[PDB]
Design a protein around this ligand. Sequence first.
Ligand SMILES: [Mg+2]
Ligand SMILES: [Mg+2]
Lengths: 143, 171, 68, 55, 104, 75, 189, 144, 145
Amino acid sequence: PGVTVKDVNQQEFVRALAAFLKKSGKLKVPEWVDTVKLAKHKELAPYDENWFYTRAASTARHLYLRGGAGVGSMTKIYGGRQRNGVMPSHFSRGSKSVARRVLQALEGLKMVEKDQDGGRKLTPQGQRDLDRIAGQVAAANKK
Amino acid sequence: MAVQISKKRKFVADGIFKAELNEFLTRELAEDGYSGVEVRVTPTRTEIIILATRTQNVLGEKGRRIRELTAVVQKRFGFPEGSVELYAEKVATRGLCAIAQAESLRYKLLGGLAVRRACYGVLRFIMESGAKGCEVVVSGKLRGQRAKSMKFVDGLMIHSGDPVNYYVDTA
Amino acid sequence: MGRVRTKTVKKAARVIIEKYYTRLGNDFHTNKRVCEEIAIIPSKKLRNKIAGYVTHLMKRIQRGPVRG
Amino acid sequence: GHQQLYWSHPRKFGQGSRSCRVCSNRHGLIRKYGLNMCRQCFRQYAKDIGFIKLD
Amino acid sequence: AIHRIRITLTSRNVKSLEKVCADLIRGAKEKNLKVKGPVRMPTKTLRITTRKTPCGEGSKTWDRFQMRIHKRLIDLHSPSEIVKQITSISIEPGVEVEVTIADA
Amino acid sequence: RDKLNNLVLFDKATYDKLCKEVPNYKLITPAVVSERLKIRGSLARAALQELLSKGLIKLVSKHRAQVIYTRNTKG
Amino acid sequence: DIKLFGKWSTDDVQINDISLQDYIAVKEKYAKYLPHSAGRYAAKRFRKAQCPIVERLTNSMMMHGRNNGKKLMTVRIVKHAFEIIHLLTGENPLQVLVNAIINSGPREDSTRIGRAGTVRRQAVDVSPLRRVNQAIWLLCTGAREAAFRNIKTIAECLADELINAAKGSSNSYAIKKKDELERVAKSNR
Amino acid sequence: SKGPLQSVQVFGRKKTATAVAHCKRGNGLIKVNGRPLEMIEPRTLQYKLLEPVLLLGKERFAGVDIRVRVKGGGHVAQIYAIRQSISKALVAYYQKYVDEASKKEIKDILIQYDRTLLVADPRRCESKKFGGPGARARYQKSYR
Amino acid sequence: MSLVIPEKFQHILRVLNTNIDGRRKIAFAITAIKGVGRRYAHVVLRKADIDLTKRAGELTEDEVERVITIMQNPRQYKIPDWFLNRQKDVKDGKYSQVLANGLDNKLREDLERLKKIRAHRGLRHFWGLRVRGQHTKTTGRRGRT
RNA sequence: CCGAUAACGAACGAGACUCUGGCAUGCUAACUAGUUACGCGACCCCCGAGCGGUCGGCGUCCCCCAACUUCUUAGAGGGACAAGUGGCGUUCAGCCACCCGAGAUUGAGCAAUAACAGGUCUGUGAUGCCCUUAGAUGUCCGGGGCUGCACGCGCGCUACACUGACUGGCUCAGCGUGUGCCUACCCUACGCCGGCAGGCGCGGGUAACCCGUUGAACCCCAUUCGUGAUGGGGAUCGGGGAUUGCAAUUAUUCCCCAUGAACGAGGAAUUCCCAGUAAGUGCGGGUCAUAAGCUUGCGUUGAUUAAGUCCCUGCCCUUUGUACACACCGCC
Ligand SMILES: [Mg+2]
Ligand SMILES: [Mg+2]
């Protein structure tokens, strides 16, 4: 009964990946994580303290689902609805430095490597880590 | 590639070239019984056929005027030299061409024939040539200063639906 | 509502019925298969509308002397 | 004036740089597909280009 | 050769393209070149919507104009050479043809 | 109907009020707890999950916009 | 066997009057696992009669501009309301809904145009389909004005609206409006 | 035993959202985009996905490995496409590789439960007209 | 947590020269101080290292004076340069955040500076019209009648 | 349309027609679309499965080194006709209900006679006549104005909140555009810097080849908030940072931190609308050096009510009255 990440609920899966990434802390967390907004269209800083671990976990999961995603692509995933105040709402993109630094911390953890073409994808041991955490979260959800 | 423009711009430009050439030929061959223009383009070269009634008139003294217009269309659009050829073609059943009949009616009115007689003659010639029907509408400052319109219609004439597009010629 | 046939279909039906009464039948599909060669119909919708009216009129004919 | 100020004002962009290729109008241009034709002139010639009405 | 060529046809009407894509491949079959099937690219629908009036007064009626561009691709592949074999184009007005090789 | 001036933190008179009959009626939601105890409602959510932790309240729904609790069954 | 929302079997639900048993659609032929089906029930007249009334309540509950496509939100609202009423009463939520509909449909009304005496010139009894439609509309409206500007959420407001309407207690906006209409019609007899 | 080439590929549509189920001989399982059927994004409508399985029983699904791909539409239109595709793939499998007795005595339960489980919804959209914001609504008009 | 109200719970505080409601959360209570918004309050709480899930009334004196010190002097507590209001001041060219009636009187002195140099924006401020180029034809009628 | 019939025979409009949407596991065809299968891999289970599970990882039009067209594309065709059944009907024209069916009324385009002193001479090298034509009403250059505000009105956008706001995570589109005759101005992947707006190198695409599997929004799942003009609302206003341009002041636009105003569902009145419709929700195109609260389209979610009437506002046909005929906004 092998377990991939596609057989587990991605929500508590990414939460468990963030928890593991927290407890085995080897990240290059930038010094301005307590200040910046995660995107242009946000109006408050993220409520959670160590949101960097959760965002890195989400990027790792997205890179597992499809490779070759660059920084501009990750801004597309983490873009949202800008309310623009009194003018009608629109769509905005995620923070480019946030996405870049999350990716750079990921190859600092060497679970992500750049492609021969643009963008970056997962490494075999990064895939192994994702699958292992998926298996353990499936086991926890069952029992 | 980068040298050639996209297909959309290319087709739009070809339509613009057709329209510009048609406008020029209409304004130039107005008194010569101009009917229409048909262009056949190939990568090797292009051929422009001028459908008109008076081919011997559109062709000047030994083709002087057709040579002149060939040089004009050469220079204005900048083809490679010898890559365009202009042929003049006599139309068949000139009573069936709305462009030729409208031009002849305009010539008659400019000459000074009464509008009633001129329009009757145009309608009679068209139906004598043979058509399901005809309709000529002349509008403007007829009679007094106050403007009026006279419509002279006979035979069959459709107005709605697709078949008007390939059954009725309008000028 | 709004299924009233017009002069074009009715006249075509009556003409082809009085010209080809032997070949026609009470089957709509056979009657729409004979029209493409017994007549020249510019439209498929017109053709099958005419065929339906032909079937109706031929049912009426076999039940009684219609004016056709 | 002389050559130094007669046409000196830049017209490298904006509405003053573009005119209709037919009637030399500066209003209601259609620049889509490089048409560069006035709104009314396109209605006039649209049969000739090939833009025809379907719906 | 050893040549493999591509011929693309594009126009505004479907009748002319269909008869060209018919007669060209028929000539190829009679001239025994094995023919890669005619591939129909998606139609390009150039839409231009414009106010009907030349004045701005009226009831805000919009006239919409369409141009349909259709294009087909036919790949001619023979073990022998192709250009010295086929030379005739047989192209009517209204349709544009472009012939490239597999390199380009 | 002017203002509700709800308590943001408990006191002695309302803490025992919460502990002694809230796990006795059928429908326990933060909204009803707030309206029948004159507390804020974030306080109500926190108190209800504290009673969950103490194990004297049964949870049924646990939805992001509507959480419903019920008392433990008797007999 | 169908168990709407995974529970609350439909087979034990009983319609107490024959006036609306051809228009309430909780029976096993109309028993659906989930109140969401794009069944084209408004394409033809009287087609909404065979539409399940849980679907009718879900369709009616999504109103007032902010809420015109949020049918998933409405379904979750209905699910929470059924949970709440099951906890509060102990019987079938569908039974509670059916009783609320029956007690909320106004048996007669008044409508006219001309020189009306009090409200309308004539008093007019209503059809069973209009009964069901008006009852569902009144229940959703009462829940909406109950939940507008208070901390009590829309689930509880719908739940206790149905609870009050199923018995008849004048605490539900639906039967308050129904009684007002009854008085108007009786005066306009 | 090891009889190969037991497969059908059947689609289902709902508001320009297509779903292609590749039903195949094997163990009994259904997956959508490589994910389990019971684990889908709009988890409110999970019963709409599980509706064919619940109606027909796991016995008939025990002999089929079904994989569904969706490349269009929204969320709920996608769900309806998936359920229609699964039901149509199962009835096509039972139509070809086993008897039409079983095909009929599953198609009936599908039909007089829900016609949309096997018949596509034809309605798609309606073009916007140049007098209002939508297909039929008009801009607000004034007289003074 | 979820206990009774603490004994040393003041219902409102006295910060700088204005009172803040201790009934609400700390991240939003000090927003009642002029010159402080949600982002500034959140960042100063984060760099004061205070639990954000507690009301303003239950903070102790050391924590509240830590907040005072950080708000008054954000430069030495790693608040980034771009985050402050009175950046590159017209008077002395120094990066400062302004926190109190200092904001009121700095606004007043800037407006009277514009009036004194008789700039167009200063004249519009003097006359009470719009200064950001808005159309005064149809809107802003309430501010006059 | 059937029928009556001093009319007979026609013509236009309607319809027919064209485009569009819905069905075709039927045909043709695909390395600028894929699917299936196989083979290399990568990871989990390896207790033991092993034709186990996932892959938008790599290959099999690289030419011998797999097929096929369901899904995509677009052509040729079919398919729906009130055809079948029951009832009503003069048992005619037709109407209602049902079966089978994808569909038993999909939306548009075109659209007659006659007319309006309806709008445009500011679209035109369409134009009559008048005016001006060298101190110009031609033309060019600089600056200002078209924005200007005691006020009134119209089309709209944002809201008044808990059916919610904020924070995070998960997961889905379809129209359609993209480097230019003049004419300079394209869509952008990826890598680096910056907190953001942006900047800097490296490419791709004249395009089913690249942006792009257009990772859109609403919605969904969790967090905080807690009925307060509140974490609703974001107007007004201060300071600062970029971008476009020759130039940003009367702020072009964008970004950050501050201020948080009216507004608690709106009188009398009044608009639009019948099914993928209204409404919520975003995304393209036009305008565009810079730019959308507009408009034209596209998709996503998706209803309540109604299958009727002439009450109001109007329209069509017939009869009738008329002192109206500029025609009741008449006349007197
Ligand atoms: Mg028509
Ligand atoms: Mg806030």
